[PDB]
Design a protein around this ligand. Sequence first.
Ligand code: HEM
Ligand SMILES: CC[C@H]1OC(=O)[C@H](C)[C@@H](O)[C@H](C)[C@@H](O)[C@@H](C)C[C@@H](C)C(=O)[C@H](C)[C@@H](O)[C@H]1C
Length: 397
Amino acid sequence: ADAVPAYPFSLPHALDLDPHYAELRRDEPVSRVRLPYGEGTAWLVTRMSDARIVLGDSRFSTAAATDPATPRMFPTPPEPDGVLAQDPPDHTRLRRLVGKAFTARRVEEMRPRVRSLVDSLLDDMVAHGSPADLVEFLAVPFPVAVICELLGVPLEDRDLFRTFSDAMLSSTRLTAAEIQRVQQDFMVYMDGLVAQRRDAPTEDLLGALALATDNDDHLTKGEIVNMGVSLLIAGHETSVNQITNLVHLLLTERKRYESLVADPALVPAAVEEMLRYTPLVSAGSFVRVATEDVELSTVTVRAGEPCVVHFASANRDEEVFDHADELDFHRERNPHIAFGHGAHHCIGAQLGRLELQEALSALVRRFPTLDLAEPVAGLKWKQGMLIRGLERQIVSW
Ligand code: HEM
Ligand SMILES: CC[C@H]1OC(=O)[C@H](C)[C@@H](O)[C@H](C)[C@@H](O)[C@@H](C)C[C@@H](C)C(=O)[C@H](C)[C@@H](O)[C@H]1C
């Protein structure tokens, strides 16, 4: 009786927002759409208080989304293993157990060694000389290296992590027969690595999860193994591409970068803005299913109905933010769900931020003359992709 528009509404341009989300926020915050895969229609959530419910409220099952027939933004139906597709109370336990060690305090204390890692990379680049591809020298290498340091991986065998990481991306460049073998090899190493943490303690994250005080809650061996793998992947692509995404915004209006060469203390406040202002997820939600009827403004979604939150839209909610379409490094408040919200609120959110602030602070500190040496018009944005990012980024300092 009506279109049942397909979502994604359009192929994305750069880090632009389809001008439709804006119209929906006024004309229809919660509307039916058709996701590219699965079966039936679903609810595109476009505003914050609504997204906060769909991501917040216990009456929405992600583990339900595992049904091949349930809508989704990607082709291969998610395995029910994934922590993302984990309902409580089991998920709630994973988060409690992992969250006890992945404290914000562990991440802020990593900083000094994360500063020391961006430097080795910004050396390699200055060795190459200007102009240089910021993807190659910084963004690709920096995150994987950071995670290795989180897991306390010895320097040798970090190439495995890099080999396994790149074997999981969308453009893997490797066949199904290869993906199988690298998986085994990596998992077995991780197996032995967790064993070493149990037998002989360390102080890295795995180490803290591996310890077990006798009379109280701790994780199994296979859980600890898998959490590490889960963190590794979930913080790779997002951070690789989020780095180029903030540099890209920083130079395209170069008035921005110079805002931070002027007052470096803005780097953290900046990083938050750019998280809120960047469609790192082009068309968004992992689907959520109402296990009971749930009431949003303007639409009450019924038990059994799948939903999709668009993060970056909520992040531009005209009530929540002012001049949400304009990048302001001096907002008093920044309630962005760029890290998601509620149960599945990004684990690595604090680490994510550490990484960004360290990449930008270093860039400002080492290259106040940083400039995009590629013409903007030439820029190679990644195509047909789930997470937005640049293929390439020649910069000149
Ligand atoms: C700029 C960096 C990052 C961004 C923007 C980001 C964003 C997100 C978002 C939006 C979600 C929620 C997805 C949903 O509920 O549909 C999420 C989940 C997650 N992220 Fe990240 N992330 C980042 C970095 C990382 C890092 C560094 C790690 C690990 C070291 C990580 C691990 C995870 C995990 C495990 C989840 C699932 C948590 C759960 O379901 O309980 N992420 N991330
Ligand atoms: C539909 C958009 C989502 O895509 C997906 O979940 C993909 C199917 C997953 O394979 C992605 C790529 C994961 O492997 C992780 C790298 C990131 C994941 C944990 C996120 O947090 C991320 C925000 C994610 O929800 C969105 C990209």
